[PDB]
Design a protein around this ligand. Structure first.
Ligand SMILES: [Mg+2]
Ligand SMILES: [Mg+2]
Ligand SMILES: [Mg+2]
Ligand SMILES: [Mg+2]
Ligand SMILES: [Mg+2]
Ligand SMILES: [Mg+2]
Ligand SMILES: [Mg+2]
Ligand SMILES: [Mg+2]
Ligand SMILES: [Mg+2]
Ligand SMILES: [Mg+2]
Length: 95
RNA sequence: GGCCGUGUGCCUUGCGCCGGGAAACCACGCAAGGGAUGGUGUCAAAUUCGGCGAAACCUAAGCGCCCGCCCGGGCGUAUGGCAACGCCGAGCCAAGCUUCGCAGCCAUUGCACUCCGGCUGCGAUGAAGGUGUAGAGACUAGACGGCACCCACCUAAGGCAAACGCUAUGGUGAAGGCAUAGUCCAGGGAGUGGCGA
RNA sequence: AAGCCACACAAACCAG
RNA sequence: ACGGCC
């Protein structure tokens, strides 16, 4: 459902078949209609498949992304989003 | 395809030698002999272009010595040659393993910030090994070759044991394939001419 | 010399 | 393999 505020958003239940370099371009464009986007982490590993992290510049870009994009059908799959359960290395090198 | 010799590769035994080993044992120098060298299964492809090295054996231009002197011969010798065979640079290669692509199935609903789940199908790469290396060479197999497993034997690092100790992912069971077993086709047996001394 | 290369080629056989 | 000899 929901967790506690964070710059990065945890997206799962994605389509596991689409390639790493292809999925990044399907994301960076689709979520920038809220604000500026930083980096996007995707791994194909047994543990990390069907999961993606999207890092924004401010909470405003992430909070609006959480509600307006929750459940949105992505490649015939209901995209589930949560707030990141831990701060990302990219942000923790600034704070 | 018999019996003598020569060389060279091979292993056993003996000595070195301390080089990799934890030990077994490999590796290196050499001397002498030929009594011993496990099993099943699996792969047949690449088979190209160059280059260095070679003994016994074959022969004697030059050279030295001699037949006193030239002509002639003779004696020794390879720097000429044949060649068992030892290899190097680039390429290339079946199966199996190293690591990445792409497809398919199997799982997986998973919180990460360094990379990563398992198989079967092609694709490329990595380490072996093979080709290059046959009498010029062509085609067939499987073995003595590659790969998997098994057994016999030796050792036991590590892992297991309180412990006498147990256990191999370690080693040993030769080389031959610079054509082995075979079909060819050269080559000699069996000619002619060129080069050479 | 020994051998090497080019044509030409009878048989068993020797033949890597 | 390379010399002999059968
Ligand atoms: Mg014997
Ligand atoms: Mg064949
Ligand atoms: Mg002589
Ligand atoms: Mg003279
Ligand atoms: Mg060659
Ligand atoms: Mg050949
Ligand atoms: Mg061969
Ligand atoms: Mg041979
Ligand atoms: Mg033969
Ligand atoms: Mg030969």
């Amino acid at each position: 459902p929901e967790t506690r505020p964070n710059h990065t958003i945890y997206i799962n239940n994605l389509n596991e078949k689409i390639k790493k370099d292809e999925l990044k371009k399907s994301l960076h464009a689709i979520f920038s209609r809220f604000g500026q986007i930083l980096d996007i982490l995707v791994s194909r590993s047994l543990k990390m498949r069907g999961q993606a992290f999207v890092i924004f510049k401010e909470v405003s870009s992430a909070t609006n992304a959480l509600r307006s994009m929750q459940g949105f059908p992505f490649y015939d799959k209901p995209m589930r989003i949560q707030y990141a359960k831990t701060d990302s290395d990219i942000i923790a090198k600034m704070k």
